[PDB]
Design an enzyme around this catalytic site. Structure first.
Site, PDB file in Angstrom:
ATOM      1  N   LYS A  52       0.811  -1.179   0.000  1.00 54.56           N
ATOM      2  CA  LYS A  52       0.000   0.000   0.000  1.00 54.56           C
ATOM      3  C   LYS A  52       0.839   1.220   0.000  1.00 54.56           C
ATOM      4  O   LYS A  52       0.575   2.189  -0.701  1.00 54.56           O
ATOM      5  CB  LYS A  52      -0.941  -0.021   1.160  1.00 54.56           C
ATOM      6  CG  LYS A  52      -2.185   0.732   0.799  1.00 54.56           C
ATOM      7  CD  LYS A  52      -3.242   0.679   1.871  1.00 54.56           C
ATOM      8  CE  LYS A  52      -4.338   1.692   1.546  1.00 54.56           C
ATOM      9  NZ  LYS A  52      -3.855   2.987   0.969  1.00 54.56           N
ATOM     10  N   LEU A  54       3.205   1.729  -1.307  1.00 54.48           N
ATOM     11  CA  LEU A  54       3.711   2.115  -2.556  1.00 54.48           C
ATOM     12  C   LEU A  54       2.696   3.013  -3.284  1.00 54.48           C
ATOM     13  O   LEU A  54       1.519   3.129  -2.902  1.00 54.48           O
ATOM     14  CB  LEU A  54       4.007   0.833  -3.336  1.00 54.48           C
ATOM     15  CG  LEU A  54       5.468   0.415  -3.479  1.00 54.48           C
ATOM     16  CD1 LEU A  54       6.414   1.256  -2.651  1.00 54.48           C
ATOM     17  CD2 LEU A  54       5.560  -1.022  -3.035  1.00 54.48           C
ATOM     18  N   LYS A  64      -6.084  -7.315  -2.436  1.00 51.56           N
ATOM     19  CA  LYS A  64      -5.830  -8.422  -3.276  1.00 51.56           C
ATOM     20  C   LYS A  64      -4.541  -9.126  -2.920  1.00 51.56           C
ATOM     21  O   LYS A  64      -4.488 -10.322  -2.796  1.00 51.56           O
ATOM     22  CB  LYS A  64      -6.012  -7.962  -4.708  1.00 51.56           C
ATOM     23  CG  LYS A  64      -7.362  -8.409  -5.173  1.00 51.56           C
ATOM     24  CD  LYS A  64      -8.022  -7.482  -6.161  1.00 51.56           C
ATOM     25  CE  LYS A  64      -8.798  -6.339  -5.501  1.00 51.56           C
ATOM     26  NZ  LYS A  64      -9.513  -5.512  -6.500  1.00 51.56           N
ATOM     27  N   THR A  93      -9.238 -13.767 -29.935  1.00 55.48           N
ATOM     28  CA  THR A  93      -8.218 -12.786 -30.070  1.00 55.48           C
ATOM     29  C   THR A  93      -6.926 -13.300 -30.708  1.00 55.48           C
ATOM     30  O   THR A  93      -6.173 -12.513 -31.286  1.00 55.48           O
ATOM     31  CB  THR A  93      -7.997 -12.269 -28.668  1.00 55.48           C
ATOM     32  OG1 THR A  93      -8.897 -11.190 -28.399  1.00 55.48           O
ATOM     33  CG2 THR A  93      -6.538 -12.095 -28.275  1.00 55.48           C
ATOM     34  N   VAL A  95      -6.667 -14.834 -33.140  1.00 56.26           N
ATOM     35  CA  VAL A  95      -6.760 -14.743 -34.554  1.00 56.26           C
ATOM     36  C   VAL A  95      -6.227 -13.484 -35.100  1.00 56.26           C
ATOM     37  O   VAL A  95      -6.601 -12.429 -34.667  1.00 56.26           O
ATOM     38  CB  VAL A  95      -8.126 -15.023 -35.085  1.00 56.26           C
ATOM     39  CG1 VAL A  95      -7.917 -15.261 -36.575  1.00 56.26           C
ATOM     40  CG2 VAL A  95      -8.605 -16.299 -34.382  1.00 56.26           C
ATOM     41  N   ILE A  98      -8.273 -10.244 -35.331  1.00 59.61           N
ATOM     42  CA  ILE A  98      -9.279 -10.101 -34.300  1.00 59.61           C
ATOM     43  C   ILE A  98      -8.616  -9.515 -33.085  1.00 59.61           C
ATOM     44  O   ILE A  98      -7.613  -9.992 -32.619  1.00 59.61           O
ATOM     45  CB  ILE A  98      -9.951 -11.417 -33.866  1.00 59.61           C
ATOM     46  CG1 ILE A  98     -10.791 -12.045 -34.959  1.00 59.61           C
ATOM     47  CG2 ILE A  98     -10.770 -11.239 -32.590  1.00 59.61           C
ATOM     48  CD1 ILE A  98     -11.167 -13.459 -34.589  1.00 59.61           C
ATOM     49  N   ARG A 141       6.532 -21.115 -34.764  1.00 59.92           N
ATOM     50  CA  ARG A 141       7.749 -20.312 -34.774  1.00 59.92           C
ATOM     51  C   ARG A 141       8.516 -20.482 -36.097  1.00 59.92           C
ATOM     52  O   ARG A 141       8.281 -21.423 -36.852  1.00 59.92           O
ATOM     53  CB  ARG A 141       8.641 -20.607 -33.589  1.00 59.92           C
ATOM     54  CG  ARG A 141       8.071 -20.091 -32.266  1.00 59.92           C
ATOM     55  CD  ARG A 141       8.146 -18.551 -32.037  1.00 59.92           C
ATOM     56  NE  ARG A 141       9.514 -17.982 -32.080  1.00 59.92           N
ATOM     57  CZ  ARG A 141       9.841 -16.755 -31.691  1.00 59.92           C
ATOM     58  NH1 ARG A 141       8.947 -15.900 -31.204  1.00 59.92           N
ATOM     59  NH2 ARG A 141      11.108 -16.381 -31.784  1.00 59.92           N
ATOM     60  N   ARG A 175      19.746 -10.354 -34.832  1.00 61.31           N
ATOM     61  CA  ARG A 175      20.537 -10.443 -33.568  1.00 61.31           C
ATOM     62  C   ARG A 175      21.013 -11.902 -33.252  1.00 61.31           C
ATOM     63  O   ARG A 175      21.476 -12.152 -32.148  1.00 61.31           O
ATOM     64  CB  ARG A 175      19.847  -9.957 -32.288  1.00 61.31           C
ATOM     65  CG  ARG A 175      19.555  -8.491 -32.216  1.00 61.31           C
ATOM     66  CD  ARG A 175      18.783  -8.180 -30.953  1.00 61.31           C
ATOM     67  NE  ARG A 175      17.999  -9.314 -30.426  1.00 61.31           N
ATOM     68  CZ  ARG A 175      16.645  -9.383 -30.257  1.00 61.31           C
ATOM     69  NH1 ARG A 175      15.809  -8.396 -30.566  1.00 61.31           N
ATOM     70  NH2 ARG A 175      16.089 -10.494 -29.748  1.00 61.31           N
ATOM     71  N   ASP A 248       6.510  -8.696 -43.339  1.00 60.63           N
ATOM     72  CA  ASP A 248       6.351  -7.272 -43.489  1.00 60.63           C
ATOM     73  C   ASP A 248       7.454  -6.652 -44.223  1.00 60.63           C
ATOM     74  O   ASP A 248       8.590  -7.050 -44.050  1.00 60.63           O
ATOM     75  CB  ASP A 248       6.161  -6.559 -42.132  1.00 60.63           C
ATOM     76  CG  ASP A 248       4.947  -7.055 -41.362  1.00 60.63           C
ATOM     77  OD1 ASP A 248       4.265  -8.023 -41.701  1.00 60.63           O
ATOM     78  OD2 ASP A 248       4.761  -6.398 -40.246  1.00 60.63           O
TER      79      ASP A 248
END
Ligand code: NA
Ligand code: NA
Ligand code: ZN
Length: 327
Positions: A52, A54, A64, A93, A95, A98, A141, A175, A248
């Site tokens: 707190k 903080l 919490k 999501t 997708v 989307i 990947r 890299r 891209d």
DNA sequence: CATCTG
DNA sequence: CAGATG
């Protein structure tokens, strides 16, 4: 980094959900600085009240933290991980094309699955359709062994079209990385720069080439300077076709390639550090240029760059092979 | 940020 | 044009 890990992560699920399911950008934003600061904090949070203390550390969050500290879990978190409506949005999501907004609309239309999606392919737009069509490949990947083959081609074709073209595959691939998730090419041409009023053909001619020989499969979005697509390394001797990969291509004014190339090559951590040091050395850096810092507070005027070299030099640093650009 | 949709 | 996605 591990002393306040759970805390930071829970806050993470929480923040994430606020934004994705609920619309709670505030709330959502809340969890985030909170995890951020707890993240920095040099001690072991032993209680909420401590937390707190903080900044960004309110009452609710403290609460919490308590329950979580108190017991290996959080009710709310448990309640959210179950809920199909929530999980749905996290999934749709995935997708390409989307986002949350969209993920919401569909669910409330009852589309909650891949199948649902196909069944309702009419409801999706072009990107979304492609995204769906290649859902699997898209999550796969990309092994650098394929990267080189890819890179190999792109470069030869860019070449044929115009000797003057300048292409670079940035990314982790650049890299060192053994695998990457997409192919990202920085492109420029002499005949294109900062003042030089446009030249769209510049980007469109290569795109064309790539589709010519069929390297490029589909078009996600095609602008005058950035192209979002799909590609694929020709299936050899039929038995093993390759997955469809995201790719891209982006046109850059010659007068800002290296800052770009640098920038795009990462890592985020390397940048920052590089960035911070530039600052010391009496400079500034960003995606497009490096400028000498006035003392009046700030100040501009683009330093001139001909390689990644010129950059380091400026900030008077050790040139870094891309491999070591890690942190 | 640049592109697309509607 | 606002608003979405990457
Ligand atoms: Na998506
Ligand atoms: Na508004
Ligand atoms: Zn301590």
């Amino acid at each position: 980094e591990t002393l306040n890990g759970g805390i930071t992560d829970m806050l993470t699920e929480l923040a994430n959900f606020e934004k994705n399911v609920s619309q709670a950008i505030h709330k959502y934003n809340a969890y985030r600085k909170a995890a951020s600061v707890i993240a920095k904090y040099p001690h072991k949070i032993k209680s909420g009240a401590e937390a707190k203390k903080l900044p960004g550390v309110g009452t609710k969050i403290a609460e919490k933290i308590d329950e979580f500290l108190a017991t290996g879990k959080l009710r709310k978190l448990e309640k959210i991980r179950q809920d199909d409506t929530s999980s749905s949005i996290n999934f749709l999501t995935r997708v390409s094309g989307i986002g949350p907004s969209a993920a919401r609309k569909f669910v409330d239309e009852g589309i909650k699955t891949l199948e649902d999606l196909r069944k309702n392919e009419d409801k999706l737009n072009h990107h979304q359709r492609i995204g769906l069509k290649y859902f699997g490949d898209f999550e796969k990947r990309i092994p650098r062994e394929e990267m080189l083959q890819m890179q190999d081609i792109v470069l030869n074709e860019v070449k044929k079209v115009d000797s003057e073209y300048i292409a670079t595959v940035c990314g982790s691939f650049r890299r060192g990385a053994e695998s990457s998730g997409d192919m990202d090419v920085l492109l420029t041409h002499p005949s294109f720069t900062s003042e030089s009023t446009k030249q769209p053909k510049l980007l469109h001619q290569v795109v064309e080439q790539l589709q010519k020989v069929h390297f490029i499969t589909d078009t996600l979005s095609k602008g005058e300077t950035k192209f979002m697509g799909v590609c694929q390394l020709p299936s050899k001797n039929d038995e093993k076709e390759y997955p469809h990969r995201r790719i891209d291509i982006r046109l850059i004014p010659k007068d800002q390639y290296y800052c770009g190339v640098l920038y795009f090559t990462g890592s985020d951590i390397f940048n920052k550090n590089m960035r911070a040091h530039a600052l010391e050395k009496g400079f500034t850096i960003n995606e497009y240029t490096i400028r000498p810092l006035g003392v009046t507070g700030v100040a501009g005027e683009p330093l001139p760059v001909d390689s990644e070299k010129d950059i380091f030099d400026y900030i008077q640093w050790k040139y870094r092979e891309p491999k070591d650009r890690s942190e």
